[PDB]
Write a protein that holds these residues in place. Sequence first.
Motif, short mmCIF file in Angstrom:
data_model
loop_
_atom_site.label_atom_id
_atom_site.label_comp_id
_atom_site.label_asym_id
_atom_site.label_seq_id
_atom_site.Cartn_x
_atom_site.Cartn_y
_atom_site.Cartn_z
N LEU B 323 0.96 -1.12 0.16
CA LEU B 323 0.14 0.07 0.00
C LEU B 323 0.94 1.20 -0.10
O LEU B 323 2.09 0.95 0.42
CB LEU B 323 -1.01 0.09 1.21
CG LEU B 323 -1.89 -1.22 1.40
CD1 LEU B 323 -2.67 -1.30 2.43
CD2 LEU B 323 -2.67 -1.43 0.09
N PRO B 324 0.36 2.50 -0.36
CA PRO B 324 1.15 3.69 -0.26
C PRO B 324 1.81 4.24 0.82
O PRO B 324 2.77 4.75 1.12
CB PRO B 324 0.19 4.85 -0.86
CG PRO B 324 -0.91 4.16 -1.58
CD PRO B 324 -0.94 2.83 -0.96
N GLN B 325 1.26 3.36 2.19
CA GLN B 325 1.80 3.83 3.37
C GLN B 325 2.03 2.42 4.00
O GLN B 325 1.33 1.43 3.88
CB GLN B 325 0.69 4.47 4.34
CG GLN B 325 -0.04 5.71 3.47
CD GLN B 325 -0.94 6.20 4.19
OE1 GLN B 325 -1.82 5.67 5.17
NE2 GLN B 325 -1.79 7.37 3.83
N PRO B 326 2.62 2.53 5.27
CA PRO B 326 2.58 1.34 6.37
C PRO B 326 1.82 1.77 7.16
O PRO B 326 1.02 2.65 6.96
CB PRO B 326 4.17 1.45 6.79
CG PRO B 326 4.36 3.02 6.58
CD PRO B 326 3.72 3.47 5.39
N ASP B 327 1.50 0.73 8.22
CA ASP B 327 0.12 0.89 9.22
C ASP B 327 -0.97 0.71 8.39
O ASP B 327 -1.80 1.64 8.53
CB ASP B 327 0.67 1.92 9.97
CG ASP B 327 -0.55 2.12 11.24
OD1 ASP B 327 -0.86 0.91 11.70
OD2 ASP B 327 -0.96 3.01 11.50
N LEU B 328 -1.29 -0.23 7.88
CA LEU B 328 -2.81 -0.56 7.30
C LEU B 328 -3.03 -1.99 7.59
O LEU B 328 -2.52 -2.92 6.95
CB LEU B 328 -2.80 -0.32 5.87
CG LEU B 328 -2.98 1.15 5.35
CD1 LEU B 328 -3.81 2.05 6.06
CD2 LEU B 328 -1.63 2.01 5.06
N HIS B 329 -3.92 -2.38 8.58
CA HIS B 329 -4.31 -3.46 8.88
C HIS B 329 -5.52 -4.03 7.78
O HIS B 329 -6.78 -3.55 7.94
CB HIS B 329 -4.74 -3.94 9.93
CG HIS B 329 -3.67 -3.79 11.06
ND1 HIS B 329 -2.93 -2.40 11.44
CD2 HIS B 329 -3.12 -4.48 12.02
CE1 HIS B 329 -2.10 -2.38 12.21
NE2 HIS B 329 -2.09 -3.79 12.59
N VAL B 330 -5.16 -4.87 6.90
CA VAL B 330 -6.43 -5.24 6.00
C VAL B 330 -7.24 -6.20 6.58
O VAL B 330 -7.00 -7.28 7.16
CB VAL B 330 -5.70 -5.88 4.62
CG1 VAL B 330 -6.80 -6.38 3.74
CG2 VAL B 330 -4.51 -5.10 4.10
N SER B 331 -8.40 -5.88 6.39
CA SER B 331 -9.78 -6.74 7.12
C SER B 331 -10.28 -7.41 6.13
O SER B 331 -10.57 -8.83 6.04
CB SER B 331 -10.62 -5.71 7.71
OG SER B 331 -11.18 -4.83 6.91
N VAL B 344 -9.76 -2.49 -1.18
CA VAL B 344 -9.04 -3.04 0.01
C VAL B 344 -9.44 -2.27 1.17
O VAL B 344 -9.71 -1.18 1.32
CB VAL B 344 -7.40 -2.70 -0.23
CG1 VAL B 344 -6.66 -3.46 0.95
CG2 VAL B 344 -6.91 -3.15 -1.82
N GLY B 345 -10.19 -2.91 1.86
CA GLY B 345 -10.85 -2.36 3.09
C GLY B 345 -9.69 -2.55 4.35
O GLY B 345 -9.21 -3.55 4.54
N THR B 346 -9.51 -1.45 5.39
CA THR B 346 -8.69 -1.34 6.37
C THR B 346 -9.39 -1.17 7.55
O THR B 346 -10.40 -0.67 7.60
CB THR B 346 -7.67 -0.39 6.24
OG1 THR B 346 -8.10 0.96 6.38
CG2 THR B 346 -6.93 -0.44 4.73
N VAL B 347 -8.79 -1.81 8.66
CA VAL B 347 -9.54 -1.51 9.93
C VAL B 347 -9.38 -0.10 10.54
O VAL B 347 -10.36 0.37 11.10
CB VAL B 347 -8.89 -2.29 11.05
CG1 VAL B 347 -9.47 -2.51 12.30
CG2 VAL B 347 -8.69 -3.91 10.59
#
Lengths: 125, 615
Positions: B323-331, B344-347
């Motif tokens: 992803l363009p950034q770190p710190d993305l929890h994919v749900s 892509v959905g993230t918490v």
Amino acid sequence: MFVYLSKRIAMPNGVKVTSIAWNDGQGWLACGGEKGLLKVLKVDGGPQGQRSGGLSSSQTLEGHDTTVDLVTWNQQYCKLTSSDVSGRIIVWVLHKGMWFEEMVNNRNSSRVVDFAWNPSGTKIC
Amino acid sequence: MSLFVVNAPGHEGQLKEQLIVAHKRRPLLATAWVNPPSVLITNSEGEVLTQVADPPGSTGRTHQPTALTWHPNEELLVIGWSNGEMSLWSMPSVSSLALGEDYTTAAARSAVQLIAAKAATQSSAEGATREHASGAVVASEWSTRGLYLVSASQQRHVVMWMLEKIPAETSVTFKLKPLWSVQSREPVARIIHVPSKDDISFLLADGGTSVTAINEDQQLFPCVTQQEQIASVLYDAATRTLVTLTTTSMIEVYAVGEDIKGTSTLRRKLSAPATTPTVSTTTGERIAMSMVWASPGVVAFGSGDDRLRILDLSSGSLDVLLLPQPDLHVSSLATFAAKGTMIVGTVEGFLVVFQHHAAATEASQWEAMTVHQVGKCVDRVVLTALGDVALCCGGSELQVLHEIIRKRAWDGVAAATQISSDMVVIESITGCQCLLQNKGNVHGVSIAFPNIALWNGSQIDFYMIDEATSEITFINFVLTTSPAFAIHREGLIYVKGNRIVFETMQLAPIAQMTFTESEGVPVIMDIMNDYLVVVSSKNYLRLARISTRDLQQLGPARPLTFLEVSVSGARVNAQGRRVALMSTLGPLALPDTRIWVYDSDTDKMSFFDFGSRNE
């Protein structure tokens, strides 16, 4: 001649089948089952429905109470004749894919045993 | 760029994230809500069509729907409840109503589908409770041709159902009748179907170690055998591939032939470290595994980490596209095959949209177009037929995001820009920058300062700015549904029915001659200075000059020469002579890489493409 199984078709509700008759005129197969069950399928006998066993049409029929036991066809006029354990004899006429009841009879004294069409298809025993 | 408009059909009931479904061809969507237990069936824009509860006869036991499935080609839903009752929701078809034949625009179809959904019906399958033995329907599935149904319960009961379409004397009804009553080893979770290339054969997965298929021979037999627990099984009907990702995250791709037997082709050890794992304690459950079919031949999965892992089954290559950034929890994950787009959905509350390049390195083929920060944790993501994406937020919350381009305008005095669903910033060169909020969502923006008209689908509201007091107040609405509307100093020009109505600020009619079906319904219009352009639904181009009194049509209606290529936008120059045309491709409203210029003097249509510039 070689005989091999090619298809199994389970009718609804898991009711034991008691009378099967196939029409030469257009491939209308008939099936009878307990508690007044009458079913009519149309299977295409042409090469489209030969290799694949094409079940083109289905139609459930009603008008019988007891187990349907005696079913017969008439190819020239494409008519159906049906009976049951109760003794209700019904002749069915095709019209736009709908099987209309034409006549209902019941001797109310004896059980009908069998039907018999003349080869010309004009008399019924 | 572009943004989603977020429509949330309001209900305080607890939505089940596992029970949002979408018709694959018709633009509808069904949701199951708890407390109260009910089913909201809406259109593809989140607008409520109908609300469904238990059919009458209940002695206060409002049962809880547990599975919802769509018909693959009809507008038909089937609902398995918590008691094993199998209900069937059916809306009557439009052609059954025998109304007029002008119902070909999108708005008329929406209105008639709304009233037909209000005129829908619910039926009950006979004896279905007994066959499930009062067990909750934990799964259901239609065949590919959609005349065989399979319902599996928590008592391991699996029942096959035959579909009978009964044409009534004034309508069409449907019935579902049981065929078999077999038992599985466990409550089956996911039911998949296999086509022969009709044929009745269903794979079943209970979330254990082995998957069990059943065919017309009434035999429940395994296909692939694994020594570890499986969670989700991906089936590709075109290649018949069966991809299983283990609970220990091991790849097992099986080629499946006509024998319904899976043969492993790629299975390589993946070292996922177990040093201080992020066990999901906020939800109190095991982290949900997520994989979907990204592209023909390519399968994607997110492991709940900050990375997205793609796997090319053609070459056996597994790589990572970050992803363009770190710190993305994919749900949760979903993919639209029509546009070649992954969602892509993230918490944390982010949706990242990945676009196929053809819609170097292979991983560069995907690229993230838009990052939409919804600001809420997403549970499940479900796409619709048209591309609208539904989200489950916070358990009891549901949103429907529809992708649009940002409406904006520039009259010459002030520029209007859309920033949200209903927030519009209007800003002049005098510093008169102010924000305005609408009742409904923004669908059209037109400005002739200080008059500014916003269209929200069902109606247009034109607001007046008193810059001396800088006060803005609604006055009156024009209830129209066309996308064609444009305001001017002379008045507002919109479309009511077939008529293109020109009125004043107090709606005093100016030009009124009734149009015909051959001329059709205008869809697009552009106003600037004293010139106007109208584009109908049949590519017809009508230039016009607006004056103090009339609308002098500068020549007749003209066609233009370009799946099919439609028209979505047009802008005319200050001479009222050249028109710039924005084209789209296909019925999916896919963007087009070329732009068009029509010159009325030479009546030519030149063009310039941007795919040469990779734009």
